[PDB]
């Protein structure tokens, strides 16, 4: 089975700025991976992205009842669906779990949190480190939780106190974990 | 606050495979089981607070299948070029001996949306507790996907995530072992 | 709450 494949994609996109106060809507049609025609709520019509989509733009712009739905989708679709799942999408908060373990390298493992906006800090003796700090970045687990690992390149001395501090919108006060000699 | 909701559809000939899913900020709200004509929620809790009439998704799929046939001919039957996936295997939590964990096989940056994923332990297939997602849209219009395997870490077990894709010359093996 | 489907347009 080496038969050729042909792929149609459609992405209906709702972009929200400051809650639902500015909303941009995109009705996007793709052939394999090539976008060929789109409706932008900021434009008001379908526009061909490539010459392959020029027939569809000209025909759909003639369907006034079709345009009336797209031109109203910011209200009838975007803002509507935003409200429908707000309580478990926009408002979802999950606590991060924080674990510190030695890897001359210390790792701070922050796991299982939502949403992704997070700040992780390393402290040595009450001072925040900036050299020898590398982070995996935001890692999506695929199940509405993130994880992120933050390494500290340090020379552990006796008596030194290392502290990992996590700031996250689900927390009213940062979480801290300490590692000593 | 910046947020993006996407209703993402594809249709694939000649496999006749269609998919319909909602994306929030890169996560799946739900997809429609095309065979059972049912809404499947990514998290069970979602089905307690919202609902969806699936026949809207089936309608869009029938339309996409008809559009694809017209577009195939308008492109002079130009087919898709396969893009092989990148595969990475990680855990969702730091590993400790005999403490329950989950292996995550991340299949990313590929098209068309067809794969065969297999979990191996010590070179033998394993299926206990496995689960997987549907094909997830990327902003470059390729696909990604997760497969999961709950497991108890040991020093004596080794694991592999084996993915098959038409863009690969041989099955790709991503290896994982304790420490 | 009930999610809305945005419809895909039909060519030709």
């Amino acid at each position, epitope marked *: 089975d080496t038969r050729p494949r042909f792929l149609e994609q459609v992405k209906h996109e709702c972009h929200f700025f400051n809650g639902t106060e500015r909303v941009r809507f995109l009705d996007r049609y793709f052939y394999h991976q090539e976008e060929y025609v789109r409706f932008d709520s900021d434009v008001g019509e379908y526009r061909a992205v490539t010459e392959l989509g020029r027939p569809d733009a000209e025909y*759909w712009n003639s*369907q006034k*009842d*079709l345009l*009336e*739905q797209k031109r*109203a989708a910011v*209200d*009838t*679709y975007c803002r*509507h*669906n935003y409200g*429908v799942g707000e309580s478990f999408t926009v408002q979802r908060r999950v606590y991060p779990e924080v674990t510190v373990y030695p890897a001359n390298l210390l790792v701070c493992s922050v796991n299982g949190f939502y949403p992704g906006s997070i700040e992780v800090r390393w402290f040595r003796n009450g001072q925040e480190e900036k050299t020898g700090v590398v982070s995996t970045g935001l890692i999506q687990n695929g199940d509405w939780t993130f994880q992120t690992l933050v390494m500290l390149e340090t020379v552990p001395r006796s008596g030194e106190v290392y502290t990992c501090q996590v700031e996250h919108p689900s927390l009213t006060s940062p979480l801290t974990v300490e590692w000593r000699a | 606050e910046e947020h993006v909701i996407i209703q993402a559809e594809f249709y694939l000939n000649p496999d006749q495979s269609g998919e319909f899913m909602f994306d929030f900020d890169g996560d799946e709200i739900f997809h429609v089981d095309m065979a059972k004509k049912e809404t499947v929620w990514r998290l069970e809790e979602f089905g307690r607070f919202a*609902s969806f*009439e699936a*026949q*809207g998704a*089936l*309608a*869009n799929i*029938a*339309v996409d299948k008809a559009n694809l046939e017209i577009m195939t001919k308008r492109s002079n039957y130009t087919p898709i070029t396969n893009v092989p996936p990148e595969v990475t295997v990680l855990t969702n939590s730091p590993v400790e001996l005999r403490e329950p964990n989950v292996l995550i096989c991340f299949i990313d940056k590929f098209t068309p949306p067809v794969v065969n994923v297999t979990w191996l332990r010590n070179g033998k297939p394993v299926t206990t507790g496995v689960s997987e997602t549907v094909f997830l849209p990327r902003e470059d219009h390729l696909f990604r996907k997760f497969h999961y395997l709950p497991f108890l870490p040991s020093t004596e077990d080794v694991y592999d995530c084996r993915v098959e894709h038409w863009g690969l010359d041989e099955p790709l093996l991503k290896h994982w072992e304790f420490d | 709450g*009930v*999610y*809305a*489907t*945005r*419809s*895909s*347009a*039909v060519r030709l």
Partner: T-cell receptor
Amino acid sequence: MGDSVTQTEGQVTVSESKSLIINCTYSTTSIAYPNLFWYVRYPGEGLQLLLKVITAGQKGSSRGFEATYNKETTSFHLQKASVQESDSAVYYCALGDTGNYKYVFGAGTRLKVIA
Amino acid sequence: AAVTQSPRSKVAVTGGKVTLSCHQTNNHDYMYWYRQDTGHGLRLIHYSYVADSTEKGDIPDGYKASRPSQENFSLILELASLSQTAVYFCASSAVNSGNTLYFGEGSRLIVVE
């Protein structure tokens, strides 16, 4: 406890050049974002669209009729300042969900215009 | 003009087969068969959004549908019953029209014993 459109029951008789108001409110549990419709069926003829509104807060008007899509009170009352002899028909209030098959119809209101 | 159905009137006996035809010239994807009762309003019997396939509506008992092409949607009454006397309305719609319904002229059916 589902989907329903409640209309003015039975017939309604109005004299020429006089005002009209037909009640329509709705309650949905399986619709997403309704569009609201008035359909009219003149004697002998079949059903035909009189007016429609897509987004809440706005009104449609045709042939001197008017109706406002009001999401605050989930109503779609049909009104006309001066009724004509040609306005004798059965008026149906309806909502549909543009992304699927669903439609909910009211029970219909008959208008009798007299001298 | 857009949607036409036939016959406009029929009188049939109980236990007899009655089929109502419906044709549309708008290339629409949806077709529906409704029943019009004075006290109940307009109830959906069967609908179709793709050719060669039929979905059952809210009151499909005693009726059967068939959609052999994109332009035709028939309603078959295998054994006509007294309870099936009403005015039957066919309709079409398509996304390109925002799924507004278009109705035919109506089929008034009376069944007697």
